[PDB]
Prior knowledge:
Layout: H1 3-12, H2 16-29, H3 34-44, H4 49-57, H5 67-78, H6 87-98, H7 106-109, H8 111-114, H9 116-119, H10 125-137, H11 150-156, H12 165-182, H13 185-195, H14 202-215, H15 218-226, H16 237-248, H17 256-271, H18 276-287, H19 294-307, H20 309-314, H21 316-320, H22 333-343, H23 354-358, H24 363-375, H25 380-396
Amino acid sequence: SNVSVLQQFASGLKRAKAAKELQHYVTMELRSTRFYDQLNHHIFELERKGGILAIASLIGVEGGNATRIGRFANYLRNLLPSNDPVVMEMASKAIGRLAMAGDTFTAEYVEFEVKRALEWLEGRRHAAVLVLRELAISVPTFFFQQVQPFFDNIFVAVWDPKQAIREGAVAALRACLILTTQRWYRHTFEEAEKGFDDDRIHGALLILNELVRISSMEGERLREEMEEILVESRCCRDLMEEKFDQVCQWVLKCSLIQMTILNLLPRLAAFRPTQYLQDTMNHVLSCVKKEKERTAAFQALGLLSVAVRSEFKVYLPRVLDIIRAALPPKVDATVFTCISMLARIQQDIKELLEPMLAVGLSPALTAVLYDLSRQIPQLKKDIQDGLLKMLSLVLMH
């Protein structure tokens, strides 16, 4: 109905939205629907979670091409003038998923915000960022009006005035452009290499890593494989040297550059196995003394050892001996990830690896131990005895 659904959405204005969606599905989808949508649109034209759950639950029955599109069009066009906080990206994704019942007019609702990509791109970049995220998730039809010029626009347009939204905007535009390209990169790479020489600067480094990932198919495979846990590729000296100088001298002028450098070192290492390797090795040697960053430092060390064979070969004693005394107290998943990724240096881990499993029972610890046993069955009985001891300590009493 309308009144009951309105009350459910009002309660969802606050775990309640999911219960409302489940109950609405169980009641109606087996066997009244448009009244709830009309009331929700009337209220929203002036809550979010419960109303969104109610709108998505009833989606996909009759085949509303314009009636639901028209109801969502007011909110879709309003989101362009006023861009909301971090909830805006997820809300746009939910709206785009719900309106994706197979209508063609959906290419027009976001098109009202599409012109902002050249017009606007907190009231300029974030609205287009949310629209781009929703479209690239469901259908980029509204923002894909310039697909030949998509690479040219994504080269520079993502540096618009946003603090947290700009990085997501770069990612959304890059994802849409990469998917379209699967369906002037060298110039952009050279420009990022030369002009690189701040918080509103690291977005450029993130896009450049995204540019290397999308415009190059060589670095895509390794980046996809390790992320779970033809001419332009030669000119690798300029960008790496510029980034190295930027990190070395002025990192935190206005440790965001540290995260950017760690990300770019991963892109260079996974791209093709110039000065980036030595520069990132020196960066990790410097970040060994860095505080409140060992969680990322261990992950970077593991990624470097897995990808860059030469970097870790001379770096045997510096890093691996540091984390061993810290993990036992209570994060350490990255250290175990590096240990497992080093082999997949053959019999060396047997002597010291015991304390790692002896630390305690954790689901992540169990997953790491299982992955090591599947990957490195050098001493299976050693794993078996520890497993028996842990299982006895747990369930025996």
